[PDB]
Amino acid sequence: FEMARTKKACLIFFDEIDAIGGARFDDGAGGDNEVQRTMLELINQLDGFDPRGNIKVLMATNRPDTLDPALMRPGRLDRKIEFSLPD
Amino acid sequence: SRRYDSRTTIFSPEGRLYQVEYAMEAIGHAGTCLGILANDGVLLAAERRNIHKLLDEVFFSEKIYKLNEDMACSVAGITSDANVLTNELRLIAIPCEQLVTALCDIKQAYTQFGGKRPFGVSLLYIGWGFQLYQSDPSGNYGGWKATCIGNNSAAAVSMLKQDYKEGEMTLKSALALAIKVLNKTMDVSKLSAEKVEIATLTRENGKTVIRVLKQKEVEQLIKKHEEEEAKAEREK
Amino acid sequence: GYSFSLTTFSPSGKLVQIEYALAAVAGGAPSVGIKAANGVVLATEKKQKSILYDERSVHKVEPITKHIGLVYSGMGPDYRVLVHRARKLAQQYYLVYQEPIPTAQLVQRVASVMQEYTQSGGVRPFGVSLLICGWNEGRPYLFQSDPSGAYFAWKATAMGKNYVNGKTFLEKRYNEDLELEDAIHTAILTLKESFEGQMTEDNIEVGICNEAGFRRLTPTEVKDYLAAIA
Amino acid sequence: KRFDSEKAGDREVQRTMLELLNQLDGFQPNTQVKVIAATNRVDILDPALLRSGRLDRKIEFPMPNEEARARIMQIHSRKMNVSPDVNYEELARCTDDFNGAQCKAVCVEAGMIALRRGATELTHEDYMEGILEVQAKKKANLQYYA
Amino acid sequence: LNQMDGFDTLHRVKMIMATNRPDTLDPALLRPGRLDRKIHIDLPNEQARLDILKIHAGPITKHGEIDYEAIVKLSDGFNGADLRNVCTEAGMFAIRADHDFVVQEDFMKAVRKVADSKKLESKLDYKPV
Amino acid sequence: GSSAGFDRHITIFSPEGRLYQVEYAFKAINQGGLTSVAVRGKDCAVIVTQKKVPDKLLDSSTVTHLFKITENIGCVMTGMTADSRSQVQRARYEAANWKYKYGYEIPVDMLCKRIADISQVYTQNAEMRPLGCCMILIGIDEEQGPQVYKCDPAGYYCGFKATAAGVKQTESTSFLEKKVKKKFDWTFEQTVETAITCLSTVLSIDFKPSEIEVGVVTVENPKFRILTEAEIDAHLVALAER
Amino acid sequence: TGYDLSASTFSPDGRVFQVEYAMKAVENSSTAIGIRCKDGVVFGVEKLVLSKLYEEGSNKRLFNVDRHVGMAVAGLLADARSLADIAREEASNFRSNFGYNIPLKHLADRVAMYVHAYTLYSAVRPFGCSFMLGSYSVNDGAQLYMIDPSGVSYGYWGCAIGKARQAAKTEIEKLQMKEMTCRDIVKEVAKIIYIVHDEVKDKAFELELSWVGELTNGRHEIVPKDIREEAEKYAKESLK
Amino acid sequence: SYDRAITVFSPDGHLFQVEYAQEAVKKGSTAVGVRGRDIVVLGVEKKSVAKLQDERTVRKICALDDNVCMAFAGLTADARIVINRARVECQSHRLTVEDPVTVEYITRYIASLKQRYTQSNGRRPFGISALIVGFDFDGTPRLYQTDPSGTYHAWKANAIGRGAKSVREFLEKNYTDEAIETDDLTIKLVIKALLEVVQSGGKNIELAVMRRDQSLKILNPEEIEKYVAEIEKEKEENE
Amino acid sequence: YDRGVNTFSPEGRLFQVEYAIEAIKLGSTAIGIQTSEGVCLAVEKRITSPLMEPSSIEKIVEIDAHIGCAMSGLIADAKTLIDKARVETQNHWFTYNETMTVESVTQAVSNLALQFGEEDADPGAMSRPFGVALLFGGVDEKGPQLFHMDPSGTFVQCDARAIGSASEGAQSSLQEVYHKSMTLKEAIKSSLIILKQVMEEKLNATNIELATVQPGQNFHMFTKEELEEVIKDI
Amino acid sequence: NQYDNDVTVWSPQGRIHQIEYAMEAVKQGSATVGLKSKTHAVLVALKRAQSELAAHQKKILHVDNHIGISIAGLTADARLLCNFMRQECLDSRFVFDRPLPVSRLVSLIGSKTQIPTQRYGRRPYGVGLLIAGYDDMGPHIFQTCPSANYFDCRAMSIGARSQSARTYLERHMSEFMECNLNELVKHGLRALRETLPAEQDLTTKNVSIGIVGKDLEFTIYDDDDVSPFLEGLEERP
């Protein structure tokens, strides 16, 4: 996001965001704690204390049920476009 | 409820019943059970895995159970599940195939509805004409002239496929075949009479005699087989 | 209740839940059974974690009939369920035949109950092994009923913690000509190797079966047997 | 939350947290720096972090109620040419279980449709089906209901 | 570990170690030769809560009878930090009402308000193994 | 502490032969925050537990963990309050059923043995959870004399000369263990005193006659009675003066 | 984590979370208070109107489980209604077997065991409502019992169930309920409900009042409109 | 009672348990049935013929009634339940109607019984397909096929089992009025069909014929060996 | 899986019901037209092999002499629905000595849909919805009437409804050809033109089923000769 | 998530999602408006057609001579509820020989519909009902939720885009009490008109009216019989 902000307008594509966008949980041990922090950083840059900039993000996932509620919130993923099977 | 359900009676994506196969894997790790049909009788040769020195010998037989006055069965697999089937086998009793079909209907029922695990027991049935049957946890039964279930069943069937002379077999020849097949199947190079369990079914005087050979009789067969095998060594 | 079996076959053809039930047996207090020429002895380690427990309140060696007795190694509460079932099964045998139930018959009837919980819906197997001792037809009887429902006829066996070593101890210390009193001595010796601390008349329970029937030795009697050890 | 493990764990982050525990309330009492913290899952947090000496006040932010949701939609429609017939009370009734972000997204999507049809003024219908966009209901042929 | 109890004996050097998760510590660290005494600073009991409350409510300006026992009875499960928060929140209730003093009613809300915040705290009973 | 499947969610064995769900029910005894102590003397049995009334709004006459299961049998419940009442209602039913079917009052050993049997089914069937409660019965037997029996969530039960269940069970067990080692057949006054002392020394409360409930059964009067605040004050005064 | 999806599953810390989650449904509902005074029990429910389209009397949180027992509920109203009929059928069966009005202590103990029975198995869910049962009689006296979703029933002098339960309890404590009567307490119950109501938050509530005492001859009934309006004016005046 | 929904709709709209049951059918012995003018021929491939196996017991062609017989493909234990249930219904129908069952009726009952197991709680679908042949009261030869789904259709000729697609493709080309002119040609047609999937030859073919006003006749190995020689003989002259 | 049969989607959709609706799209196309002169029911047989007897593919069934049904989707499932319709009718006749209205027949069959569940159900209760769509057509007091049933239990009167694989294309074709005042012979032809355009195979008198319930006249399946007469035109 | 698959699973927020998901089934249904006056309580429904060659789905169902309902949601579930309420109304006639009180009938369906929302494997009745009836206590309009919670409403609207109708019902609520039968229906038709898109309008094909009064039995009005009600109301601005 630092390098995306060095541009007047930018597009970031997050293909297969379910790799890091999984929902936070506590399984006793530190299960997926590190990856959750990466997701927490991505959430912070999208909508945090600082303005994001002219970045318009775009994420694709075939497992949207696994994404964290904070990432699936407007202001981070405002539009939820569903690619259902064609009619 | 749905969370803890293992769904035993469902179809695998390839069309198989996993619990049935996993049950059949249990028989493969169980004791070797032999069965050979002859013209004047049929025998059940069973490997004994309760061969601990401190195990008391009180029962008539360990794996071979008498169903009725005409039939006997030997089980391979989970012994506790075998006791359930042997009791129900007795309650059903009768022609030999009718008894086998009736129990296999019970066994097939546990693989279709009820949600319970299947009976992990394979049975070899002998009875009076003379006939030998094999059953599987899937509920599939088949008549045989010579068959084996349990450990190294495939190896035992392989030597039966080669050494079983169809039609021209008596009890003495079949009993000799039982020791020879069991020798290669069991890892023991001697095959003492305490690790083998032989029972013969024969018609005497118009009455069926189901008898479990005493340890003295079996040692003669193990002895006679070893000299006969030693005789083949003289050729080479 | 749940109508699906909680015990299922693993891909390796093993009833994994049954094996885990046997793991609970291996964690129970040691139980030793010896079938001598003139009787059977049942002994166990009835050791409490504090003196506040009343030792005589609950007994681990419990009679089933006038001639059959039980000792377990595993889960205490599950043993009482099997004790009640064994007594009920022994009675159901008695009303119909008007004869005391044979030892081999009760084990088969009890082991059938244990097998049910390995196949029935929504229940786990009993986490105990039952050592059944009895006297029928003038001959002593000793049986072991595993959680799976398999029953084995033992001349001498040990269950519970350190049962593998106790079994080998019996191989080198048991003979078929042994008498009942020497069986008690051998039984206490078998417990002693796995025992930690000192064996008093209250921290072990000994039960014997002979022609007079099955009775649980009082702590006073066990003291006399214990004195011969040292 | 810290945990006991024998094979692996995130002890480095737990060390960073343990430092932050000392800075909030430790050997040297720091009474000149005010600390604000924000989280979405307070159940994850270590109990020593939620202590009454480190985070004295734990403010629960609720889902905006009917009055708040109308207020939020009014807040984000000030810089927007909105026609004087939008019933924000009705929109607040049409946005149950909407957080502040969705209520703002309702206003953002409303101008999307107005630009979609070329309007220079937003109507109540633009807000109404801008709620549908924010709702993100999956496509269904549920016209056989009723 | 080698300095607390190793080859060279530690003379006239004492060690104090503080942790609220002693369950995660190494057995060698918790070994008696290194950490001889394991002192349990447990949650305050009824009398201990009364003692801590008077410590923190002491400098607080107040009129009227202050039933410290009433606050103690609703302070079950509190630690020393809560009892100071109860004193702090009671003052902020007074600040909210433009009061220069704190009454028992101010403490009553404060102890109840802090008790609500204790539901977000997970298990605390951790002991050395 | 290995796990395999649902051994943590339903009452099925772990790879090492452990019922974690049953173990978790034991931790529910400490959820109430109360400790119960039962001491058996030469001719009496006393159950003592702490009563907590956080606010004056609550009717203190209704906060009771001492329950009269029978005219001659009484119990102290520790753990979840809701589960404790269910066991008490079940125990009352079995005591009444025993009197109807068998014609004589149910022995204390047989009362929990049924309750332990009832609670064992919860540890074998996976459709229900074990009751997170511990039951301590006291009663005077016709021949065995005073009896104290604990009745755990797992169906374990035993006779006790002095038992305790709750948060401070292990600390109170050590205190009672030390006293019984002295081998004194305590009178009624000593047994109440050592019951009150055990709860007092472990909790460090210095009880008032409104923070503990005492229930006694004596050979001379084999009936379960709840000690009045005045009666508890007499023991508290006697304990203090020594 | 899977430790909170069934009522038959204990957490590793020995807590049934499904029951605790049902507790949260009660804490999301409006506040109902009940005060046991010298000569009866008075119930007060802050009854928000979700819309002006509801008639005055809709969603009654005050029930009559018997001719001498009332019921103030909080939480899931459908579960509150279902527990009302369980109390009604328990009271009806008690009279049809023993021949007298059901004691409130036994009525509370009987319904609570029904509530507790839904907290043990995965085949049913815990009831998402907490309720208070209040009764008065010449012999037993004024009694006030509150039953929670876990199945715990305690007697009370003054109780509050709802989101402002903590705030209302502080207001109840200032009362000398053991000495004042129902007539003096209906004004107080009105005052406490008005104090704990949040006008900036969910607003437009309706004061639902009910009582049972010696002035109603041991019969639970809605407080008459004349007294209810008199208390409402006093409650509104107390807010200055 | 185990009350659980084994067969449920996939999101695409498929009953996967039914499809998996149809997958077990594809692992069974190839069963071939041809409806002739005055004869019905059922041919079943034999899996790994063992010299120690009693051929009488493992028989995939069984007679439901004197005029109806069927051959299955799939799980052997599953089929034996269907045959017994079908056999009991044949006698129940004869008791009530006083008329031998029609092939349509017993293929409808088996299909209905099979369908019931795809919509009932706790029951997995039957993993067999049935090739029901027989004769009605008016002497018309009928051949019917059921699948685990519960759909029954009438066929002039059909194949079920592992090599159903190959045999059926062979049957669509060689089933003509000339090919069923005589009984011997009709019996040769099934052997020609089964030779397409049976590698070794007639030793792995089990043949059962039923003629009008006659009971089911299992063909002995010598009779089958006689036929395969004729097909082998007729192959030479066509080259 | 984890989901039960009676589980609601976040959008309010019964998952199993919506899934059973998708099963119809794999079924054969069926066209039903209601006219003043009677009701028309057509369905494609979808022969997959020349060895299959076309007559055995019965996709139009005589519910009664005055009402018939055209089915699409899982044919095996509609047998259970058809059987009760042939039982509910002849039960109305037993109790009321009159022929049951076409709407009432569809109403009775519709109640079977959604009578499925996992737990707390009778032993004979179903486990999944009926993955079939029915087109009831018959004559009653209200004259010719056509009703459409779906696995959701939702039945509705339709003037011209097409179900099956080509429901979308045939319904659009039906709207362009259907007017309220048209003869039944036009309905037979118009349905056959639409079918021939949507069928995979070439349309002939053996791969289709035609049935009509005229007023006065009874339910009549079209024979090969009758079908060839209307096929010869288009 | 893991808290939405069964009706016996409480979410950590004290909510049941399966109940909430069933509540969305009503919102997918077509709009219906129920309002009452001093002497009458009429139901106005906006019927929907899947295709223009299909009839519009019936929404107002006759439960008893004095009670009528308008459904919104699963039609088969509505039939199951209506059959239950038809029998209960019939049962009260058989025993007490009196009309079943409307308030007393809704209580039965509120307890009937609560049982599936609490047991494992059951689902809430995915249907919303607007009950209109007359008894000794006057006209009533009741709204029944899949959550088994019923509301005694003086004027209610449920279905798709029903909140616009509720806005109209709230605005002209005060004049409902004293207006006559004709004015009451026009208010409901005007309320139901707010749910329609701009280009759509109330027609005889998509409007059904059910009226119950003091001396008037519950009668359902259809395409021919709704024209005497539609022609009076003016075109919307």
From Swiss-Prot, chain F:
Residue(s) carrying N6-acetyllysine: 99, 101
Oligomeric form and interacting partners: The 26S proteasome consists of a 20S proteasome core and two 19S regulatory subunits. The 20S proteasome core is a barrel-shaped complex made of 28 subunits that are arranged in four stacked rings. The two outer rings are each formed by seven alpha subunits, and the two inner rings are formed by seven beta subunits. The proteolytic activity is exerted by three beta-subunits PSMB5, PSMB6 and PSMB7. Interacts with ALKBH4.
Q: Name it.
A: Proteasome subunit alpha type-6
Example of a GO cellular component annotation carried by this entry: extracellular exosome
Which PROSITE patterns does the protein's record reference?
Answer: PROTEASOME_ALPHA_1 (PS00388), PROTEASOME_ALPHA_2 (PS51475)
Q: Which residues carry this modification: Phosphotyrosine?
A: 156
Q: Which family does it belong to?
A: Belongs to the peptidase T1A family.
From which source organism is this entry? Homo sapiens
GO molecular function per UniProt = endopeptidase activity; NF-kappaB binding; purine ribonucleoside triphosphate binding; RNA binding
Give the residue spans that cross the bilayer: none
List locations, semicolon-separated.
Cytoplasm; Nucleus
The UniProt keywords, alphabetically, are: Acetylation, Cytoplasm, Glycoprotein, Nucleus, Phosphoprotein, Proteasome
Q: Which residues are glycosylated?
A: 2
Provide the function of this protein: Component of the 20S core proteasome complex involved in the proteolytic degradation of most intracellular proteins. This complex plays numerous essential roles within the cell by associating with different regulatory particles. Associated with two 19S regulatory particles, forms the 26S proteasome and thus participates in the ATP-dependent degradation of ubiquitinated proteins.
Swiss-Prot record, chain G:
Residues that bear N6-acetyllysine:
52, 201, 225
**One of this protein's GO BP terms?**
proteasome-mediated ubiquitin-dependent protein catabolic process
Q: What is this protein called?
A: Proteasome subunit alpha type-3
What organism, scientifically named, is this protein from? Homo sapiens
Family per similarity comment? Belongs to the peptidase T1A family.
Phosphoserine sites (modified residues): 238
Subunit text: The 26S proteasome consists of a 20S proteasome core and two 19S regulatory subunits. The 20S proteasome core is a barrel-shaped complex made of 28 subunits that are arranged in four stacked rings. The two outer rings are each formed by seven alpha subunits, and the two inner rings are formed by seven beta subunits. The proteolytic activity is exerted by three beta-subunits PSMB5, PSMB6 and PSMB7. Interacts with AURKB. Interacts with CDKN1A. Interacts with MDM2 and RB1. Interacts with the C-terminus of TBXA2R isoform 2. Interacts with DNAJB2. (Microbial infection) Interacts with HIV-1 Tat protein.
What's an example GO cellular component term for this entry?
A: nucleoplasm
Report the gene name.
PSMA3
Q: Where in the cell is it found?
A: Cytoplasm; Nucleus
Q: Which Cys pairs are S-S linked?
A: none
Pfam families referenced in this protein's UniProt entry, alphabetically = Proteasome (PF00227), Proteasome_A_N (PF10584)
Q: What induces it?
A: Down-regulated by antioxidants BO-653 and probucol. Up-regulated by bacterial lipopolysaccharides (LPS) and TNF.
Q: Report the domain of life of the source organism.
A: Eukaryota
Record PANTHER family:
PROTEASOME SUBUNIT ALPHA/BETA
Which Gene3D superfamilies does the entry mention? Glutamine Phosphoribosylpyrophosphate, subunit 1, domain 1 (3.60.20.10)
Which InterPro entries does the UniProt record give?
Ntn_hydrolases_N (IPR029055), Proteasome_alpha (IPR050115), Proteasome_alpha-type (IPR023332), Proteasome_asu_N (IPR000426), Proteasome_sua/b (IPR001353)
> What broad class describes the main subcellular location of this protein?
cytoplasm
Curated annotation (Swiss-Prot), chain H:
Tell me where in this chain the PTM Phosphotyrosine is found: 152
Per UniProt, subunit arrangement is: The 26S proteasome consists of a 20S proteasome core and two 19S regulatory subunits. The 20S proteasome core is a barrel-shaped complex made of 28 subunits that are arranged in four stacked rings. The two outer rings are each formed by seven alpha subunits, and the two inner rings are formed by seven beta subunits. The proteolytic activity is exerted by three beta-subunits PSMB5, PSMB6 and PSMB7. PSMA7 interacts directly with the PSMG1-PSMG2 heterodimer which promotes 20S proteasome assembly. Interacts with HIF1A. Interacts with RAB7A. Interacts with PRKN. Interacts with ABL1 and ABL2.
Q: Which residues form the signal peptide?
A: none
Q: Does the record carry Transmembrane helix as a key word?
A: no
What is this protein called in UniProt?
Proteasome subunit alpha type-7
Q: What is its main location?
A: cytoplasm
Keywords, sorted A to Z: Acetylation, Cytoplasm, Glycoprotein, Host-virus interaction, Nucleus, Phosphoprotein, Proteasome
What is its biological role? Answer: Component of the 20S core proteasome complex involved in the proteolytic degradation of most intracellular proteins. This complex plays numerous essential roles within the cell by associating with different regulatory particles. Associated with two 19S regulatory particles, forms the 26S proteasome and thus participates in the ATP-dependent degradation of ubiquitinated proteins.
The known PTMs are summarized as: Phosphorylation by ABL1 or ABL2 leads to an inhibition of proteasomal activity and cell cycle transition blocks.
Q: Which gene encodes it?
A: PSMA7
Pfam family of the protein (one): Proteasome
From Swiss-Prot, chain J:
Q: Which SUPFAM superfamilies match?
A: N-terminal nucleophile aminohydrolases (Ntn hydrolases)
Q: Give the induction text.
A: Induced in breast cancer tissue (at protein level). Up-regulated in liver tumor tissues.
Quaternary context? The 26S proteasome consists of a 20S proteasome core and two 19S regulatory subunits. The 20S proteasome core is a barrel-shaped complex made of 28 subunits that are arranged in four stacked rings. The two outer rings are each formed by seven alpha subunits, and the two inner rings are formed by seven beta subunits. The proteolytic activity is exerted by three beta-subunits PSMB5, PSMB6 and PSMB7. Interacts with NOTCH3. Interacts with ZFAND1.
Membrane-spanning ranges: none
GO function term, MF aspect, one: lipopolysaccharide binding
- Positions of crosslink type Glycyl lysine isopeptide (Lys-Gly) (interchain with G-Cter in ubiquitin): 112, 205
Q: Give the UniProt keywords, A-Z.
A: Acetylation, Cytoplasm, Glycoprotein, Immunity, Isopeptide bond, Nucleus, Phosphoprotein, Proteasome, Ubl conjugation
Where, per UniProt, does this protein localize? Cytoplasm; Nucleus
| Designated name of the protein | Proteasome subunit alpha type-1
- Which Pfam family, any one, appears in the UniProt record? Proteasome
Described function: Component of the 20S core proteasome complex involved in the proteolytic degradation of most intracellular proteins. This complex plays numerous essential roles within the cell by associating with different regulatory particles. Associated with two 19S regulatory particles, forms the 26S proteasome and thus participates in the ATP-dependent degradation of ubiquitinated proteins.
Is Acetylation given among the entry's keywords? yes
- One GO location term (cellular component): nucleus
The entry assigns this protein to a family as follows:
Belongs to the peptidase T1A family.
Q: Which residues are glycosylated?
A: 107
Positions carrying Phosphoserine are 107, 174
